[PDB]
Every structure is written in structure tokens, then in C-alpha cells.
């Protein structure tokens, strides 16, 4: 299902990439997207899939488009258009200068100072989850750790019941990795239906949770509205539930397959921070975009007003111009270049939280379960979309080689 090429699109620029079902998926999701960076592909291409849109394939263009909010607007950041149109999360669907006030608030909730406050729980949950797994010599890492670890920390931050997870998780998944089961507007509506009562409850009787803080915040000297709070929280959920979860699986899948990388972190712990950035570069997983506010010539390609462009945050760091031997994991790279957390005014607020969750996990897992591998004959399946994921990750290990702490 390729849409007919618009008249302004030169046929030499066509490359029919399906962000939702890329051809090389078997090889891995990063590898499947990396095809866009082969010598045969122009830097800026047009795909006829998903209704037709542009894709920037290079770190250079991605960074520029991100910096340029005057031309590339956040207003409609998701492909396909219907999804981008229904998308109304704050601060993500807004441009500066309006964005700024909303960002300052979300920052109060997810920011540095919150991490510093939650540090002991993160460490506590990580240790508890691992210890519980250790003696079993086998898990489903995605269901057993990747999911509960980050999610329970989020549920804690948000003051939401663990009971709600499954429901919330599903709706979130529909938004980033649509199934066909529900349209974006539908999913969005369901999420909002969930939240509305909660926001109401917390405007009345405020707590110390993230929702209470957002529901009663000030923006541009006045109180946030119910609709604004709902739009903020909807974003917080997607970030809390769907990002860190997916990243850990990719990282763990890699560690499971590379004994020498595990060893390196075991002996040279001082390398964990560097390694964490290198995994962020190598297993980058977000791809959203922007919308042209007007006709604009960019790197000699004529973009028309209303055109959408995918600016895959995932691709910057896989770009050979940015990182020599990009598909290779090297914890001792002199410079790890990526835009895994974005670039420009929308730079990820939760990055501090995400790095803490990653680093604790590496340190704590390796401490207790230094030697593990993928279950014999398990075929690991990746999934692509706005946020790419791993379907399941069966791990196996010998209990006898683990260490209780
Ligand atoms: C590995 C984990 C994560 C990745 C790769 C990631 C990636 C991103 C990216 C690429 C953007 C910008 C999108 C754009 O420019 O359209 C973003 C923005 C955002 N992320 Fe993160 N994120 C992660 C974790 C989180 C977490 C855990 C939270 C909160 C619980 C979160 C909250 C946010 C918020 C609030 C923004 C919007 C900032 C603004 O618009 O000013 N993120 N993230
Ligand atoms: O809406 C979105 C922007 C990035 C963070 C969550 C999801 C991907």
C-alpha cells in the first residue's frame, strides 16, 4: 500500500521504507533501519508507505531539522498523518516559545532532583527483582524484568495502582507500535478516559505524586488547565511505560550474546557510564518527526507546506559520518555521538531517570548473574515503530555460577 507520489517529489528521491514493517527485520531493528544509510540512498528520501512522507537519513540533517522549529513543527510529530493529527501531548506537540513553560513543569516531576530522591528505591527494586530471578536459571527478561522494573518505578512516581499496568501498557503499545487493533485516536481516547477522573481527584485532594504536581502546577503565571494536565500526563505515561522497557531488552539481548562485553564491565566497573552511552548509541530506538510549516528548500530538496518528515533519532548514532564502525559495540570509543534522547528544544527530560535505571540494571545484574545466554533455539523478534521493541527474550543460565548479594 504505496500512496501515489505527489507532484513535487522527484522520482530519484523515492525509497519505499515502511517504518512499521521494514524489510530486514529479521536481522534486527537497528540493522533494518540502517539500510537507509547505504551508499545507494540519498540523504533525504520520500517513502510512499504510511501515506507518504520524507525521511532524513543522516545525523547532520536530523540535528538541523530538530534545531529549526520555525520550519519543522512539532505540531504533527507522528506518522501516519491521522496519528500525528490526533497527537496532542504536551510538551511534545508544541513549539517554542510556548513549549518552555510546560517543559519547566514536566521537569519538576521527572528531572534531576527527582532521580536523586528515587535513587534508593530504584536500587532496591532492581536488586529485589534480580535476586528473585537468580535461582531459577531462566526467565522471559521482557516480562520478568524489563517491564516490571521501570514500570513499577513509574507507578510509584505517579501514585498509580500496579493493577492498572496491563491496561495502560496495551494502550501505550498501540500508540508506538500499532497493531491494526485500534487507531491512534481510539487509543488516545481510552488513555484519556483513564486519566481524567484521576486528575479531577488530584486537583481536589492533592498528593505528592507526579500527577498531583502536574494537575496543580502554574504555567505562565496562571494555573494549568484540566485539559493541559491530561495532555501532559498522557505523555508521561508513554515515556514511563514504553521507552526504558524496550531499551533494556535490546541491551540485555546484546549482553547475553557477548561474553567479552560482560567481562569488561565486571572487571572495569569504572567503564559502566561509558558503556551505557555506547549502548544508548547502538541500541537507539525512537523515531518521530516534524511537519513543514511552509514551502522550504532543505539541502536542495523542495519540501512543501504540510509535508511530514521522519527525523529518526535512532539514525544519528548509526551514521558512519558520526561514528566509525557504527554497528560495532566499543565501550572505549573516544567520542560516542548520538541523539537517542533527541535534540533541540524537545530534548528528553527523562534522560536522567533512564540513565539511572540502565546503569543500576547493568551493575546489579552482572553482580549476581555474570554468565547467561539466550535460550537454545529461541528466535528473538524485534518490532519497529515510533518506539521499537523486542517481542520476548528467553534467557537461561546455570544457578551454580550466580552470586547472591
Ligand atoms: C531510553 C529511554 C528514553 C528514550 C530513548 C527517550 C527518547 C526521547 C525522545 C527522542 C524525545 C523527543 C521527541 C521529539 O523531539 O519529538 C523524548 C522526549 C521526552 N521524553 Fe524521553 N525518552 C526516554 C525515557 C523517558 C522517560 C523514562 C521519561 C519520563 C518518565 C521521558 C519523558 C520525556 C518527556 C517529558 C519528553 C518531552 C520533552 C519536551 O518536549 O520538552 N522519557 N524522549
Ligand atoms: O510521544 C513520543 C515522543 C518520544 C517519547 C515518547 C514517544 C516517543
| Residue 228 near residue 211 (C-beta atoms within 8 A) | no
Q: What angle, rounded to 10 degrees, do the helices at 165-176 and 226-242 form?
A: 90
C-alpha to C-alpha distance for 329 and 282, rounded to whole angstroms: 7
Range of the structural domain that residue 186 is part of: 1-405
Tell me how many domains the chain contains.
Answer: 1
- Ligand 2 site, residue 387, Cβ cutoff 6 A: yes
| Residue 308 near residue 81 (C-beta atoms within 8 A) | yes
Q: What letter would DSSP give residue 265?
A: H
Q: Is 291 exposed, middle or buried (0-12, 13-18, 19+ CB in 10 A)?
A: buried
DSSP letters of 287-311?
Answer: -EEEEESS-EEETTEEEPTT-EEEE
- Ligand 2 site, residue 92, Cβ cutoff 6 A: yes
28 is annotated as an active-site residue: no
Strand partners, 288: 311
243 is annotated as an active-site residue: yes
349 is annotated as an active-site residue: yes
- State phi, psi for 289 to the nearest 5 degrees: -160, -160
CA 376 to chain centre: 29
User: Distances from the Cα of 316 to the Cαs of 30, 47, 107, 183, 211, in angstroms?
Assistant: 11, 19, 25, 29, 33
Ramachandran sector of residue 30 (left: φ over 0; alpha: ψ -120 to 50; beta: rest):
alpha
User: Distances from the Cα of 318 to the Cαs of 32, 35, 311, 329, in angstroms?
Assistant: 12, 11, 13, 11
* Ligand 2 atom nearest residue 238's Cα: 6
Strand partners, 291: 73, 308
The alpha carbon of 89 and the centre of ligand 2 are apart by a number of angstroms equal to 9
The alpha carbon of 301 and the centre of ligand 1 are apart by a number of angstroms equal to 29
User: Distances from the Cα of 205 to the Cαs of 91, 158, 200, in angstroms?
Assistant: 25, 15, 9
The catalytic residue among 144, 209, 242, 307 is: 242
Longest dimension (CA), the chain: 65
C-alpha to C-alpha distance for 172 and 174, rounded to whole angstroms: 5
C-alpha to C-alpha distance for 246 and 257, rounded to whole angstroms: 17
| Residue 149 near residue 126 (C-beta atoms within 8 A) | yes
Q: What angle, rounded to 10 degrees, do the helices at 148-158 and 351-368 form?
A: 140
Q: Provide the edge-to-edge strand list for the sheet that holds 44-47.
A: 44-47, 53-56, 308-311, 288-292, 72-73
CA 240 to chain centre: 10
In the three-class reduction of DSSP (H, G, I as helix; E, B as strand; rest coil), residue 193 is classed as: helix
The alpha carbon of 201 and the centre of ligand 2 are apart by a number of angstroms equal to 26
C-alpha to C-alpha distance for 144 and 128, rounded to whole angstroms: 12
Q: Name 320's Cβ contacts closer than 8 Å, sequence gap at least 6.
A: 37, 326
**Which helix (H) or strand (E) element contains residue 138?**
strand 138-140
DSSP letters of 233-255?
Answer: HHHHHHHHHHTHHHHHHHHHHHH
Asked if omega into 183 is within 30° of 0 (cis), the reply is no
- Ligand 1 site, residue 244, Cβ cutoff 6 A: yes
C-alpha to C-alpha distance for 194 and 241, rounded to whole angstroms: 15
Residue 139 assigned ligand-binding role: no
User: Distances from the Cα of 127 to the Cαs of 9, 81, 149, 216, 365, in angstroms?
Assistant: 54, 43, 10, 34, 8
User: Distances from the Cα of 38 to the Cαs of 31, 42, 154, 355, in angstroms?
Assistant: 11, 9, 39, 31
CATH number of the domain that 165 lies in?
1.10.630.10
In the three-class reduction of DSSP (H, G, I as helix; E, B as strand; rest coil), residue 109 is classed as: helix
Q: Is 333 exposed, middle or buried (0-12, 13-18, 19+ CB in 10 A)?
A: middle
Sign of the alpha-carbon dihedral angle for 165, 194, 355, 87:
positive
The alpha carbon of 166 and the centre of ligand 1 are apart by a number of angstroms equal to 22
The catalytic residue among 81, 100, 177, 271 is: 177
348 is annotated as an active-site residue: yes
Q: Name 214's Cβ contacts closer than 8 Å, sequence gap at least 6.
A: 105, 106, 109, 224, 229, 232, 233, 236
CA neighbor of 233 nearest in space, from 261, 195, 266? 195
What is the experimental method?
Answer: X-ray
- Ligand 1 site, residue 350, Cβ cutoff 6 A: yes
C-alpha to C-alpha distance for 215 and 204, rounded to whole angstroms: 10
C-alpha to C-alpha distance for 367 and 254, rounded to whole angstroms: 17
C-alpha to C-alpha distance for 277 and 332, rounded to whole angstroms: 11
C-alpha to C-alpha distance for 54 and 49, rounded to whole angstroms: 10
C-alpha to C-alpha distance for 395 and 251, rounded to whole angstroms: 13
Considering only CA atoms, give the Rg of the chain: 21
Strand partners, 242: none
| Residue 373 near residue 395 (C-beta atoms within 8 A) | yes
- Ligand 2 site, residue 239, Cβ cutoff 6 A: yes
- State phi, psi for 81 to the nearest 5 degrees: -45, -50
- Ligand 1 site, residue 92, Cβ cutoff 6 A: yes
Q: Name 221's Cβ contacts closer than 8 Å, sequence gap at least 6.
A: none
CA 159 to chain centre: 22
Amino acid at each position: 500500500n504505496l500512496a501515489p507520489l505527489p507532484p513535487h517529489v522527484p522520482e530519484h528521491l523515492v525509497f519505499d521504507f515502511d517504518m512499521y514493517n521494514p524489510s530486514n527485520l529479521s536481522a534486527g531493528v537497528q540493522e533494518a533501519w540502517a539500510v537507509l544509510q547505504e551508499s545507494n540512498v540519498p540523504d533525504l528520501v520520500w517513502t510512499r508507505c504510511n501515506g507518504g512522507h520524507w525521511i532524513a537519513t543522516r545525523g547532520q540533517l536530523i540535528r538541523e531539522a530538530y534545531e529549526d522549529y520555525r520550519h519543522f513543527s512539532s505540531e504533527c510529530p507522528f506518522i501516519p498523518r491521522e496519528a500525528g493529527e490526533a497527537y496532542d501531548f504536551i510538551p511534545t506537540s508544541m513549539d517554542p516559545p510556548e513549549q518552555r513553560q510546560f517543559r519547566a513543569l514536566a521537569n519538576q516531576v521527572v528531572g534531576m532532583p527527582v532521580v536523586d530522591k528515587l535513587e534508593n528505591r530504584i536500587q532496591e527494586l532492581a536488586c529485589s527483582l534480580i535476586e528473585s530471578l537468580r535461582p531459577q536459571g531462566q526467565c522471559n527478561f521482557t516480562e520478568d524484568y524489563a517491564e516490571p522494573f521501570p514500570i513499577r518505578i513509574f507507578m510509584l512516581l505517579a501514585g498509580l495502582p500496579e493493577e492498572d499496568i496491563p491496561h495502560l501498557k496495551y494502550l501505550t503499545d498501540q500508540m508506538t507500535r500499532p497493531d491494526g487493533s485500534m487507531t491512534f485516536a481510539e487509543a488516545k481516547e481510552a488513555l484519556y478516559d483513564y486519566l481524567i477522573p484521576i486528575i479531577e481527584q488530584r486537583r481536589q485532594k492533592p498528593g505528592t505524586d507526579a500527577i498531583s504536581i502536574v494537575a496543580n502546577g502554574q504555567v505562565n503565571g496562571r494555573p494549568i488547565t484540566s485539559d493541559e494536565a491530561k495532555r501532559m500526563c498522557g505523555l508521561l505515561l508513554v515515556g514511563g511505560l514504553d521507552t526504558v522497557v524496550n531499551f533494556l531488552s535490546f541491551s540485555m539481548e546484546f549482553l547475553a550474546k557477548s561474553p567479552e562485553h560482560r567481562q569488561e564491565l565486571i572487571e572495569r566497573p569504572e567503564r559502566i557510564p561509558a558503556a551505557c552511552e555506547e549502548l544508548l548509541r547502538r541500541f537507539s530506538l525512537v523515531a518521530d518527526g516534524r511537519i513543514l510549516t511552509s514551502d522550504y528548500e532543505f539541502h536542495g530538496v523542495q519540501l512543501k507546506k504540510g509535508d511530514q518528515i521522519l527525523l529518526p533519532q535512532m539514525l544519528s548514532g548509526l551514521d558512519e559520518r558520526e561514528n566509525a564502525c557504527p554497528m560495532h559495540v566499543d565501550f572505549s570509543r573516544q567520542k560516542v555521538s548520538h541523539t537517542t534522547f533527541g535534540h533541540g528544544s524537545h530534548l528528553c527530560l527523562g534522560q536522567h531517570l533512564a540513565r539511572r535505571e540502565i546503569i543500576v540494571t547493568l551493575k546489579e545484574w552482572l553482580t549476581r548473574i555474570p554468565d547467561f545466554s539466550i535460550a537454545p533455539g529461541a528466535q528473538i523478534q524485534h518490532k519497529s515503530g515510533i518506539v521499537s521493541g523486542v517481542q520476548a527474550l528467553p534467557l537461561v543460565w546455570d544457578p551454580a555460577t550466580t552470586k547472591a548479594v
